[PDB]
Design a protein around this ligand. Structure first.
Ligand SMILES: C[N+](C)(C)[C@@H](Cc1c[nH]c(=S)[nH]1)C(=O)O
Ligand SMILES: [Ca+2]
Ligand SMILES: [Mg+2]
Ligand code: NI
Length: 145
């Protein structure tokens, strides 16, 4: 695992975490499709390797805050809008962002071979996945992780 604090990390601390981890390839190069780098009572960290078709779908992280750092490549951070015309932001290698627990988003459109580091605190034990039925009606399925 990683040698992290024995407490929850907030948004800025998770962002610091994913960015410093990207600077320490000894922590993750071997795991270069996902690999856990660390799971305890306070923090989850994953390494994700992306194919072009990968798509998280729309989801929240329940009570988890989180942060993402793109190590190689680029992907789209998408935010949902009620009208239906969703925001898309390309996040490129070297760049990172963070979010509190109210965040709903979707990650897709990755460059093939992209690599990112994701950290969540409290741990990512539940995730809400949104879906739309035939009539356009939205639901949230809470998934254990
Ligand atoms: C690696 N993982 C735990 C299996 C998750 C984590 C995840 C990927 N993207 C976002 S946002 N969260 C996933 O790939 O769904
Ligand atoms: Ca690339
Ligand atoms: Mg350093
Ligand atoms: Ni997410």
């Amino acid at each position: 695992e990683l040698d992290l604090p024995e407490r929850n990390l907030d948004r800025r601390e998770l962002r610091d975490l994913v960015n410093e981890l990207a600077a320490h390839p000894e922590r993750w190069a071997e795991h270069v499709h996902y690999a856990s780098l660390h799971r305890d009572a306070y923090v989850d960290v994953w390494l994700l390797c992306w194919r072009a078709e990968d798509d998280t779908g729309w989801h929240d992280h329940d009570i988890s805050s989180g942060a993402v750092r793109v190590v190689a490549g680029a992907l789209k951070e998408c935010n949902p809008r009620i009208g239906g015309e969703h925001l898309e932001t390309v996040v490129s290698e070297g760049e990172s962002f963070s979010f509190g627990p109210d965040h709903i988003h979707r990650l897709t459109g990755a460059v093939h071979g992209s690599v990112s580091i994701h950290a969540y605190s409290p741990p990512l034990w539940r995730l809400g996945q949104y879906s739309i039925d035939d009539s356009g009606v939205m639901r949230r399925v809470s998934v254990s992780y």
